[PDB]
Amino acid sequence: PRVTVLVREFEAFDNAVPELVDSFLQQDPAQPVVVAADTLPYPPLALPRIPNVRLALLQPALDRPAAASRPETYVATEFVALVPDGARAEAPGLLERMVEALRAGSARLVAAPVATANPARCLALNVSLREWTARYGAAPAAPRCDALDGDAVVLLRARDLFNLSAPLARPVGTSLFLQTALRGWAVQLLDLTFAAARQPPLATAHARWKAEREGRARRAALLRALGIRLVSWEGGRLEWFGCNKETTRCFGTVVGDTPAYLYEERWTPPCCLRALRETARYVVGVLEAAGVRYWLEGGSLLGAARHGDIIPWDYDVDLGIYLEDVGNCEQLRGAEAGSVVDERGFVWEKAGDFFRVQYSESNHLHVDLWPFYPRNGVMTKDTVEFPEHFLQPLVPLPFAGFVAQAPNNYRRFLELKFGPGVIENPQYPN
Amino acid sequence: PRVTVLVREFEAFDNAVPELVDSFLQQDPAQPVVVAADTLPYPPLALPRIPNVRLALLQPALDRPAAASRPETYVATEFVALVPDGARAEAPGLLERMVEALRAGSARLVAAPVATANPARCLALNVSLREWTARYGAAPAAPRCDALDGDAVVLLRARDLFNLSAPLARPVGTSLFLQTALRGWAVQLLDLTFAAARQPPLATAHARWKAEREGRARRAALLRALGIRLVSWEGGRLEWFGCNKETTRCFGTVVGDTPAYLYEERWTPPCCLRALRETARYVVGVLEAAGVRYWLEGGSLLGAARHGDIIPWDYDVDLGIYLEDVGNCEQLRGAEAGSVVDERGFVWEKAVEGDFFRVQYSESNHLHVDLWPFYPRNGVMTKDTWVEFPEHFLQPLVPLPFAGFVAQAPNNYRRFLELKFGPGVIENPQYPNPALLSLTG
Amino acid sequence: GPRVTVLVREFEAFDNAVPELVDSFLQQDPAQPVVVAADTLPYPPLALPRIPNVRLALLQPALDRPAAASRPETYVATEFVALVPDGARAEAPGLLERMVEALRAGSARLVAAPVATANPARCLALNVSLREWTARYGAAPAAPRCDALDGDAVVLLRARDLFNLSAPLARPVGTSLFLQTALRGWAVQLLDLTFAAARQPPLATAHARWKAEREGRARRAALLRALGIRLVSWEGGRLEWFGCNKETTRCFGTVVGDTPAYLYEERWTPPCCLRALRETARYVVGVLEAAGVRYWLEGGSLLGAARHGDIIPWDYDVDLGIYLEDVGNCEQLRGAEAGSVVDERGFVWEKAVEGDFFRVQYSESNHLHVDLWPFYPRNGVMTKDTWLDHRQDVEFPEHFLQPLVPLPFAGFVAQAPNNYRRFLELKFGPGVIENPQYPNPALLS
Amino acid sequence: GPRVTVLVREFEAFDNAVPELVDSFLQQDPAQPVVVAADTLPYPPLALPRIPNVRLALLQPALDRPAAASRPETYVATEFVALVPDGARAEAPGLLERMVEALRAGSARLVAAPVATANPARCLALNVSLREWTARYGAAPAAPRCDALDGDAVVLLRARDLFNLSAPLARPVGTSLFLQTALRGWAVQLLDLTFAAARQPPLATAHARWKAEREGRARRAALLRALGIRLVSWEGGRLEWFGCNKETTRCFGTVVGDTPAYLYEERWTPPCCLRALRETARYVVGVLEAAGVRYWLEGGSLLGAARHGDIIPWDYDVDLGIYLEDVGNCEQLRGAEAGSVVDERGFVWEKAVEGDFFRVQYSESNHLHVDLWPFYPRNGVMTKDTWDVEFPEHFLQPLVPLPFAGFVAQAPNNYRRFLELKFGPGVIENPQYPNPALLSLTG
Ligand SMILES: *[C@@H]1O[C@H](CO)[C@@H](O)[C@H](O)[C@H]1NC(C)=O
Ligand SMILES: *[C@@H]1O[C@H](CO)[C@@H](O)[C@H](O)[C@H]1NC(C)=O
Ligand SMILES: *[C@@H]1O[C@H](CO)[C@@H](O)[C@H](O)[C@H]1NC(C)=O
Ligand SMILES: *[C@@H]1O[C@H](CO)[C@@H](O)[C@H](O)[C@H]1NC(C)=O
Ligand SMILES: *[C@@H]1O[C@H](CO)[C@@H](O)[C@H](O)[C@H]1NC(C)=O
Ligand SMILES: *[C@@H]1O[C@H](CO)[C@@H](O)[C@H](O)[C@H]1NC(C)=O
Ligand SMILES: [Mg+2]
Ligand SMILES: [Mg+2]
Ligand SMILES: [Mg+2]
Ligand SMILES: [Mg+2]
Ligand SMILES: [Mg+2]
Ligand SMILES: [Mg+2]
Ligand SMILES: [Zn+2]
Ligand SMILES: [Zn+2]
Ligand SMILES: [Zn+2]
Ligand SMILES: [Zn+2]
């Protein structure tokens, strides 16, 4: 029952890694221990310079072979125990007990909380790469759970850990369970408890603030690298890691009306959909304030009728307007002369049948406004047409978080523009 | 089929990779081709959907195994030919011709220029990790080279390429030869030319500007990641990638009188030495203009007498001054009352601890020159906080080159240094010892 | 499931196939843990792959290394370890796994697979007797279950078992390992699995093999001497000696307190010392008989003869009584009164300094000796003028020498007093024949 | 409970006072832990008290013992160990307790108390240089704080410190312990405490001392060779050598791949090898000057002369250039063209296998060598028709004196230039000592 202790989560400026290692060596002087780091930690860890204690540096180096940064190269045992900074080994044979529980149980990961101020708690975790979203909540089948929040020693087989794509990506507490829950693996939170370091790290408030700031930065870089734009929680809390008003939109310029995310087998990033909803809400409010007649058109109306929201793989919003009302709103009249950035940061342009309103100068998620005019009972443009009675009157229809205006009998409207059964038969990307 | 074509250097928004792949498949439909990218290139490359053509996405992903991001997974031949975008296979049998050249010669790499506007040139290259420097120059033994500049097809054994730490780090033209030259590997530039693409990529000024801005940023991030702080060409045209007046110094706060770079088995970063030289030159200029008697002290005098410069693993500069001259310098007068940032950004501070003066390069970069005031008492210069020495060593002072300018030293500075440090200290440098530092701490 | 560390100990720095050995295992598993152990840093350089799963363990002391750096167990983190000799290669995949599976399913603590060299391993029996400084090898009665192996094999066992041995990696391992495992009652199961030989084997020339076998023979002799194995025997009767001879010093040096140093080490007289004592006793008896000197077995030599016709197994000399008036009959004896004498066969004869007796040493360098004690009859009682402070040195009736009787001793027939049971009990006490004890029980019994 | 274990390692089996030593400590505290350590069972018997707190530790492999039995840590259950030499005696009670209090309150990893023998312990300075294979001793400038002790002392330190060393009990302990502790930067504090001498001291006769010193000198010589200490010096002088010489082979033997064995050991050239190189260079230069052969420092020899007036400390040979027209002046050189020549002082002169140069070896057995490279002017440029880059002739018109290896040698004029033509700009100012990590990557 040989188990390698692997230490990955610690701060170079303030840690208790020397105590952690010394505590395990007191139980077994030949205990295999691997401390992993991206760069050489300074101030020096001053680990014992003995063969069974090794420092694994995970970044590329001009003077090292490929194997030097591959962590499975440092681990020869069957099992590996991820130990966070702040833990120490007090009683003996706790790793042995964790191995017995693993072999006895049915979960590929077992875990023992560390008696810190934040001991690990069970969590449910639901990962959707298609929607760039990870959803956390309370674990129904605790102590069997999908993920952990807080400090714990996690033990699993080395073949399972090191076949993951990013086994030691920081923060491990986020990166590991995103990967294991995606594979359908479970973590069993055992009744065992590891003691806290007798001289804990981050004792001052300034040190904790510094470490929390670095940790938030690593977590944001981790999720952006792995394609999680949104972390949502049971209870409603949202964590965003995508585009915003001051950034580019996530996918950039589209070619052949097929954005980049479709080729990646994903749908629209949720940050982009959120920006489209807020631009739709804003533009609708401006048009209504100015007394401009608008209705939902195209895929926006289709999504409204289907689920009251933007079709989750679409990337813009379409609205029809009465051409004779264009002069009622200041932004459209200005858009005739040139680009208009109003006081809320939205960009109105004509560019030349329709109008386009972009979320901001940097974020080019947009709503298109298509003017129509009644020639003799039929609404028509100049660069397909439909009868005007579909607009007399307009009906309230929920869309993107607010009540929009839609053509009356819009299911019939949508089936003239798209064909029979379009609401019930979404054209899923493949 | 013994060679796998590997394409790493291209841009997603403007490339000729489809023509490249097609040109090799026209010569052999079974030719193994691998296009490597960090993320899925957009717009779609639309490569042929055949077994011998594979798109390798090297970034880790939540739904992929570890092997998916390791490039050797995608190659099953003995050799790899790194082909840059803009090349095209025209004459058949060029890859087999490069293989026979490789086996018959003594170079680990062989290369063939691509007939673009920037065809590959033979270069010399020495990599010094201790000095954080990559020194380029004209190749003395061309067409045997240490590195190439320009477009070339580079062929080498897959075993050699994928044994490197960063085999496909971008730009390849930079990272590959930094790694192979450090290992003492040569590349032989053959008398073989690959044709250019018939529709070349980046054919407009705007497209090239986008590509060069992105390639410049990738090169800067690569050299910082790999610890190359200075790149030179024939000892000149310096390119810096380290600290400066507006940043922190490279190694930050020193613990246990041992800076971080010693634990990394290197010497002082050259950007840090450059800033130390500039600060010593500036402080000396100020002290001389104000009429302050100074002399090189400690390891600065030792370095000056040894080779006329800072000891390349030291991280500060020491000067002795006459205490009765302190009042002549505005900055030193101001330093007694508090921290002073002078008109050129240097920070002058009075050490309340050891009673010396410290001049820092800038408010953010704490590379410093220390000033040690001495006063005579019965012919011996002495201090009040802590070795004292006879004053006759200062009567008179002598000129001594140091750090690119002529500094002042005690007369008989060899005897002076020997009394301070011991006999033979000038001829026996205390070279850094990683093995010993690993044992002592 | 099973993690196994390959450990390489048996190779020569001047000529080896260790690079091919390690690379062959790395081709089956790139992360395969491999430990090469050496006493000093091999030059020319081994040039192993400088990857973290391949490590070199130097078993020398060094001023800049902790104690753990030379203890090989700190390099092995796996449950199992496989000793692999130079000249072997990993060809078939998963052989270490099959060896682990056979270990767990069997009852032996060691399992082994031969290597397809010109000398593949063979099953051997072995009992070790430290007290008699002897290791006895024979044919395996219950093959494929053995006490030892002869030849090249991969040997797999638990790290906890290997590194709790006193000298796990002492060279040659093929000798050292099984001396330690057989003494502990452990068995090695010889499996029907075969490792391939290296494609470019080491020691390809006759001259390279010649300097390798001489270096190995030097290491084996040093090993057995360090571990106290004086004699190795094989079925068929072949003997290898590693102790005394005519041309060296005796094994144990000067004796204080009647108790030689090996008895405190809980061992008996080394078998080489006993052999020399028998040869010297046989020779001296022939000289005295040819010279017409009446002699009889005395002291511990007579007691050992009466018990089992041989030297007492912990005794260290041989004692004979002779008639004083016969001394002039022997040329060596007459010369000994004038000084030290080295005779026709290299034996050294001297008149001692202590107490009026003669001593015959095996050689000038080897001081195993026969002591000749001259007696003369006063009036029916044998006596002498100077006495040693032993309870065994007394007068005795001359009728015990009239006549002398034959008695086997040390491989030949010797002359003994008649009624030697009563003779021995008079000088040693009742029941001495039936109650063996060490020379002086007050210090060691 | 006791906190110190007395450990005895330095004694002779044939003549010791270890029984008196043990008894004296047991008289102060009958439970006092005592360990006597030895490579083999001491004979004659020590006859130590048969009590659980007195144990004989045998540091030898044995067929019938576990690995723990030969590890001294196994025998010590206390925090501290007191290494006590033979000839010491415990009289004043509680001396071990004072040493513990002294160690805890001070800043030295070791503390020590002299034994009142004829050779009390003295405070010494000690610099250990593994790269130079040298142990340099001297007077201790900051006594009572020392790097090493010479003489008899009880030395106390933590068990975990002592047994963490590679060779904690290697003999002589007086040498091996401080070589290990001084290299680590540990200090020993010589306390103002004195242990008494044994009432019946060991080795009381001149003959017994002579045998003990002979065995101890043999142990020291084997210890220093095993640990890679080739040179011991006192105050820079009184040299004591433990390496190669005129009668032996050179330390590193045959060089493969132009990378001598000491580089892989992460050390520089052994000082015995450097000493023989300086002697051979001085001899050869003396021969060539007396015979009228014009020579000059070449290659790395000239570089070492210009940098610090000596051989570069990681080089292993010496290179000189000569005028080919002058080779007939020297008898040794003229005989070297016919074959190998062993001159009157044991030096071996040979003409190169291939390469057309001369080689002078220190002796028939020691192959440390000086190479002579003959050039000849071809219209103002020096050239050898065999290939040492060709250079113009005016650098030898004239030659200049340059200190090298303890004597004055000839160098090309403007040798700073000369070196930069052959090695590159700034070569004198930029020495790069061996990089073992780069060697581990390069091969
Ligand atoms: C043992 O010595 C090594 C130095 O070689 C050091 O790293 C380690 O911490 C030491 N251990 C103890 C317990 O002193
Ligand atoms: C994950 O999916 C299940 C259905 O498979 C759903 O019931 C559950 O609520 C999801 N988890 C979270 C945290 O939303
Ligand atoms: C992945 O799993 C396989 C099978 O369990 C194993 O052979 C391989 O070593 C693993 N990869 C690692 C540990 O990197
Ligand atoms: C990879 O490079 C290392 C040098 O760090 C070398 O030791 C090793 O042999 C190389 N492996 C291969 C397969 O070339
Ligand atoms: C000796 O065996 C024990 C178990 O019996 C084990 O815990 C220990 O690690 C072993 N020692 C060595 C040096 O392998
Ligand atoms: C030891 O080294 C120091 C500093 O290098 C030096 O001052 C001292 O003289 C040296 N002592 C000896 C005995 O060599
Ligand atoms: Mg702390
Ligand atoms: Mg659109
Ligand atoms: Mg300083
Ligand atoms: Mg007898
Ligand atoms: Mg006797
Ligand atoms: Mg040479
Ligand atoms: Zn977005
Ligand atoms: Zn810098
Ligand atoms: Zn013997
Ligand atoms: Zn030498």
Structure tokens belonging to residue B347: 């920070």
Strands A366-374 and A317-322: parallel
Boundary of a domain, candidates A227, A242, A257: A242
Sequence-separated (6 or more) residues with CB below 8 Å from residue A192: A94, A97, A98, A101, A112
Using beta carbons and an 8 Å cutoff, which residues of C are at the interface with B? Answer: 64
DSSP-derived letter for residue D66 is: B
| Sheet strands (E) in D110-201 | 110-114, 122-129, 134-139, 145-146, 148-150, 153-158, 188-190, 196-197
Report the residue numbers after which chain D has a gap, meaning the C atom sits over 2.5 angstroms from the next written residue's N, or none.
387
Q: How many beta carbons lie within 10 A of that of residue C284, not counting itself?
A: 24
Same domain, residue pair D441 and D327: yes
Tell me whether the omega of the peptide bond preceding residue D30 falls within 30 degrees of 0, making it cis.
no
What residues line ligand 2, using a CB cutoff of 6 Å?
Answer: A 124, 126, 135-137, 234
Distant-in-sequence, close-in-space partners of B311: CB < 8 Å, separation ≥ 6: B299, B302, B303, B429
DSSP string, A229-293: -EEEETTS-EEE-S--TTS--SS-S-BTTB-HHHHTT----HHHHHHHHHHHHHHHHHHHHTT--
In this structure, the answer to whether residues B324 and B204 fall within a common structural domain is no
User: Using CA atoms, how far apart are residues D272 and D252, in angstroms rounded to an integer?
Assistant: 11
User: B332 and B222 in one domain?
Assistant: no
**Rounded to the nearest whole angstrom, what is the distance from the C-alpha of residue D348 to the centroid of ligand 12?**
16
Same domain, B97 and B181: yes
Indicate which atom in ligand 6 lies nearest the CA of residue D235. 13
CA distance C181 to C127: 10
Q: Is D430 labeled as ligand-binding? A: yes
Ligand with an atom nearest the CA of residue D439: 4
Burial B415-440, CB ≥16 within 10 A → b, else e: ebbeebbeeebbeebeebbbebeebe
- Which of C14, C15, C43, C267 would you mutate first to test chain D, the one with the most D CBs within 10 A? C43
For residue B237, give every residue at least 6 positions away whose Cβ sits within 8 Å of its Cβ, in sequence order, or none. none
Pairing, β C80-83 against β C4-8: parallel
∠ CA D45-D48-D54, nearest 5°, is 135
Contacts of A354 (CB under 8 A, 6+ apart): A368, A369, A370, A371
Contact C3 A78 (CB under 8 A): yes
- Amino acid code (one letter) for C4: V
Resolution (A): 2.4
Quote the tokens at residue B393. 């060593």
Nearest CA in chain D to C257: D44
Regarding whether C266 and C139 lie in a shared domain, the answer is no
User: Rounded to whole angstroms, how far apart are CA atoms B161 and B80?
Assistant: 8
Distance, in Å, from the CA atom of B148 to the CA atom of B170, rounded to the nearest integer, reads: 15
> How many other C-beta atoms lie within 10 A of the C-beta of residue B210?
15
Give the strands of the sheet with D148-150, arranged side by side.
D148-150, D122-129, D134-139, D231-234, D237-241
Residue where the block lists tokens 């750090």:
B403
Domain of C362 in residue numbering reads as 244-445
Which residue, B100, B224, B95, is CA-closest to B169?
B224
CA of D256 to the centre of ligand 16 (A): 17
Quote the CA–CA distance of B40 and B37 in Å, as a whole number: 7
Tokens 């010297």 identify what position? Answer: C280
Domain boundary among A242, A273, A302: A242
Side chain identity at C103, as an amino acid letter?
L
Residue D28 and residue D85 in one domain: yes
Asked if A148 contacts A109 with a C-beta cutoff of 8 angstroms, the reply is no
Report which of D184, D144, D142, D146 is spatially closest to residue D162, judged by C-alpha positions. D184
Q: Which of D243, D270, D286 is the last residue of a domain?
A: D243
Helix H or strand E segment including B357: strand B357-360
Which candidate, B135, B113, B133, places its Cα nearest to that of B124?
Answer: B135
Q: How is residue D169 written in tokens?
A: 């009990």
Q: What are B33's strand-pairing partners?
A: B5, B53
* Residue C309 φ then ψ, to 5°: 60, 35
The amino acid sitting at C264 is Y
Please say whether the beta carbons of D373 and D320 come within 8 A.
Answer: yes
Rounded to whole angstroms, the Cα distance separating D414 from D412 reads: 6
**Preceding residues of all breaks in chain B (C to N beyond 2.5 angstroms)?**
386
Nearest by CB to residue D309, choosing from B128, B427, B436, is B427
What are phi and psi for residue A404, nearest 5 degrees?
-95, 175
Q: Which of D311, D158, D216, D253 is nearest to D10 (CA)?
A: D216
Provide the domain count of chain B: 2
Best residue for ligand 4 mutational test, from D438, D441, D442 (most atoms within 8 Å of Cβ):
D441
- Give the ligand whose atoms come closest to the C-alpha of residue C248: 15
Q: Which amino acid belongs to residue D237? A: G
For the beta carbon of residue C198, count every other beta carbon within 10 angstroms: 19
Which residues, 6+ apart, have CB-to-CB distance to B202 below 8 Å? Answer: B11, B14, B208, B211
Please give, rounded to a whole number of angstroms, the shortest distance from the CA of C25 to a CA of chain D: 21
**For tokens 């060094």, what's the residue?**
C62
Do A227 and A198 lie in one domain? The reply is yes
Ligand nearest to the CA of B372: 9
D307 close to D315: Cβ distance less than 8 angstroms = no
CB pairs under 8 A between A and D: 5
Q: Are C274 and C241 in contact (CB under 8 A)?
A: no
Cis preceding linkage at C172, omega within 30: yes
CB atoms under 10 Å from CB of B204, counted, come to 9
Within this chain, do residues D161 and D248 fall inside the same structural domain, yes or no?
Answer: no
Give the Cβ contact number of residue B319 at 10 Å.
Answer: 26
Count of beta carbons in the 10 Å neighbourhood of residue D273: 25
- Which chains have 3+ CB pairs within 8 A of D? A, B, C
List the one residue out of D111, D124, D216 whose CA is nearest residue D173: D216
Nearest residue (CA) to ligand 2, atom 4: A126
Å between A65 CA and nearest CA of chain D: 8
Q: Token pair 């160990």 is at which residue?
A: D81
Asked if residue B103 and residue B238 are part of one domain, the reply reads: yes
Cα dihedral value D343, D348, D352, D358, nearest 10: -60
User: Burial letters for D198-213: b for 16+ Cβ neighbours within 10 Å, e otherwise?
Assistant: beeebbeeeeeeeebe
**Would you tell me how many other CB atoms lie within 10 Å of the CB of residue C339?**
9
Is omega for the bond preceding B41 within 30 degrees of 0, making it cis? no
A383-A389-A390-A394 Cα dihedral, nearest 10 degrees = 110
Closest C-alpha among A391, A371, A393, A392 to residue A382: A371
Chains that touch B (3 or more CB pairs under 8 A): A, C, D
Residues making up chain B, counted from first to last: 441
Q: E strand or H helix at A189, and its extent? A: strand A187-189
- Complete DSSP assignment for C99-151: HHHHHHHSS-SEEEEEB-SSSB-EEEEEEEETTTTEEEEEE-TBTTEESEEES
Q: Is D244 annotated as a binding residue?
A: yes
Question: Å from C50 to nearest chain D CA?
Answer: 7
Rounded CA separation A211/C417 (Å): 98
- Chains with ≥3 CB–CB distances under 8 Å to C: A, B, D
A355 and A256 both lie in a single domain: yes
Q: Are C384 and C373 in contact (CB under 8 A)?
A: yes
Residues of D in contact with B183 (CB under 8 A): 441-442
Query: Are residue A249 and residue A232 in the same domain, yes or no?
Result: no
Structure tokens at D340: 């190998």
**Other CB atoms within 10 A of residue C308 CB:** 12
Long-range contacts of A401-407 (CB under 8 A, 24+ apart): A401/A277, A401/A281, A402/A280, A402/A281, A402/A284, A404/A280, A404/A284, A404/A296, A404/A304, A405/A294, A405/A295, A405/A296, A406/A295, A406/A296, A406/A301, A406/A304, A406/A305, A407/A295, A407/A296, A407/A301
Cβ contact D69–C165 (<8 Å): no
Best CA proximity match to C269, nearest among C279, C281, C261: C261
> What distance in Å separates residue D442's CA from the closest CA in chain A?
9
- Asked whether residue C197 falls in the same domain as residue C256, the answer is no
- Which residue of C76, C96, C160 to mutate against A (max A Cβ within 10 Å)? C76
Separation of alpha carbons C366 and C250, rounded Å: 5
Across the interface, of A60, A64, A165, the residue whose CB is closest to B61 is: A165
**Spacing, Cα C162 to ligand 3 middle (Å):** 27
